Design a protein around this ligand. Sequence first.
Ligand SMILES: Nc1ncnc2c1ncn2[C@@H]1O[C@H](COP(=O)(O)OP(=O)(O)O)[C@@H](O)[C@H]1O
Ligand SMILES: [Mg+2]
Lengths: 37, 50, 468
Amino acid sequence: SAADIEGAIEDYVSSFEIGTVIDAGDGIAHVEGLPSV
Amino acid sequence: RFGRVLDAEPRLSALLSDYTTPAEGRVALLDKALTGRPGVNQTAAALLSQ
Amino acid sequence: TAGRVVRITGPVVDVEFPRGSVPELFNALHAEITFGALAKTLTLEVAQHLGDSLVRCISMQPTDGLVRGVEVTDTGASISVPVGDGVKGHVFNALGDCLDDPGYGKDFEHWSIHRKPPAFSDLEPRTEMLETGLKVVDLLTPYVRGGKIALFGGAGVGKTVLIQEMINRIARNFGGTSVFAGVGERTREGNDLWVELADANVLKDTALVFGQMDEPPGTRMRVALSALTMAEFFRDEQGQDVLLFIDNIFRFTQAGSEVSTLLGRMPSAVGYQPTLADEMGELQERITSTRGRSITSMQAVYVPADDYTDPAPATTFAHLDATTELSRAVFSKGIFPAVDPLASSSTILDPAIVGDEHYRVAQEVIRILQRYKDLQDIIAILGIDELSEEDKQLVNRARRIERFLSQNMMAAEQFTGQPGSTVPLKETIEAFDKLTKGEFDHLPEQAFFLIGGLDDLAKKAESLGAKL
Ligand SMILES: Nc1ncnc2c1ncn2[C@@H]1O[C@H](COP(=O)(O)OP(=O)(O)O)[C@@H](O)[C@H]1O
Ligand SMILES: [Mg+2]
C-alpha cells in the first residue's frame, strides 16, 4: 500500500520530563531521561 | 518481498527495531499494518512476527 | 531525509541520518537552537563517517542550547563563501556572512572553501625581491614578490605590529587586491585594522575575513580556508596580483588540535593531532603563486612558549620562502623589530639574485653577530677587558650593528610616539658595509638606536655630541 502504513505509524505514535541519577561522585552526576534538555 | 519493502521504508523498520518499547505493541503494529494482508502466507507472517 | 542530533559534546556533534541520506564529508549541515536567549542556526561541517549512518561534525557556532534529537538538514555542499570583486572593502566571517553590511553578497557567486592545491606542473619558483624599506628585512630576510613570507615569534614580540607595518609598506601602493585573514586573533585588533584600512583608503581594495579567538574551534579552523578561497578566486579568475595577509596561521593548527581528541583521534607528540602536518600541508600548498599568477602571502606564525622546536612552527617552516623570526631576547633588549638576524632566512639571499655586494654585506653582518653571540658569555663572566684586541673591536662593531638593525616603524608610532622611517635598500647596504668596516666606531652606540638611514644617524650623533 505504502500509505496505510503512514496512518498506522501515526496512530501508533498517538496511542504510544523527569530524569533520574544513574551514578554520581566527586561533583559529577549522570542523569538518564530528560530527552529535551 | 517483506525484507525489500521494509528496506524501502526505513522509518517503519527503525520503529519496529526499538526493543525498548514493549514487543507486544510492535508485533501488533506489524500484524495490523504489514503482516495482516490478503496475500500473506500465514507461516511467513508467524515467522516475521516472531 | 533529515538527520537528528544524537550526541552533543562541546563543539562536536554526532548526527544520525536515514540510510542512504548520509552527507558527504565536509558538507554543511544546519541545525536550529530555539532557546530564546541563544536562538541561532548552527552550521556543522561533517568531519567523519562513524558507520551505521552516524556522522561526526564540527560546529561553527557554540552549541550551547542545542538539544538531542533536533532535525539536522544537509545543504548538499561544503561551506561556501562569496567571491568576486564585490567582497573588496567588506568584512566577512568564516561562513561568508558580511559583518559590516549583513546580507551583503548573498547573491554573489559562491565558492566552496575546500579546494585542491594547484597541480605541480603549474608551479614556478619565484625569485624577485620585494623591497620593504626595513633595514633588517631588506638586508637579511629579503622578501619575495609572489612568494611566501612568514613572521615567526612568541606571544607579544611584534608579529602583528610587523604585519601592520608590511600592510602600510606594501598594500598601500599595491596595484592588485588584498585579502586579510584574521585567524583566531583579538577582536580589538580586527576592529583597529578595519578602521586603519578605512582611514588609509586601502579598504576599498581589501577583503577582510575574521574568525576571532572567541569563536569555537570550527570557525578558527575554517576562516583561513574562507579567506584563502577569496584569494584563490582573485588569483585564478580575475587574473590580478593578490596580497594575502594571515594573522595568525598557528591558530588554524591550534583549533584543529582542540577538537582532535573529541573527534576520536589518539594524540600525537606534544599534544598535537596526528594529522598536523597533513592539514597544514593542504592549507599551505593552497597558498601559492602559480605560473603567471601572483600571490604574495605574509603569514604571522605564533611560536608556542617561544619554543621554535614545537611541532607547529617546525612543520610550518618547510612551507615558506622567507622567514623573519622574532626573538623574545631581542625584544627584551628594546630592539625593534625584534628580529633574530642569526635565525631568520630568505631563499633569495644569494649572490645570483640579490647581487654580490648585498650578499657580501649580509654574510659579514651575520658573521659578526654570530661571533658576538659566542663572546656574550665571556663578556658576562670575565668581562670585556680579557678579550683580544680584535675581539673587542668586533664586539663594539656588533653592538653598533645590532642597534642599527633596529628601526622606527610607522606602525610603532602609537607605542614609541616617534614617526617611522623608510630606508632604501642601497642605503641600507652602504650603511652596513660602512659599519662592518668600522667606519662608525667613533659614534656612541646609542646613536644607532631606532633610526632610519645614515642621515638620521648623523642627526642622532649630533644630538648625542658625536659627528660622522
Ligand atoms: N616596532 C615596535 N616598536 C615599539 N614597540 C613595539 C614594536 N613592535 C611591537 N612593540 C610592542 O610589543 C607589543 C606586541 O606586538 P604585537 O605584534 O601586537 O604582538 P605579537 O607579536 O604577539 O603579535 C606591541 O603591542 C608593542 O607594545
Ligand atoms: Mg598579534
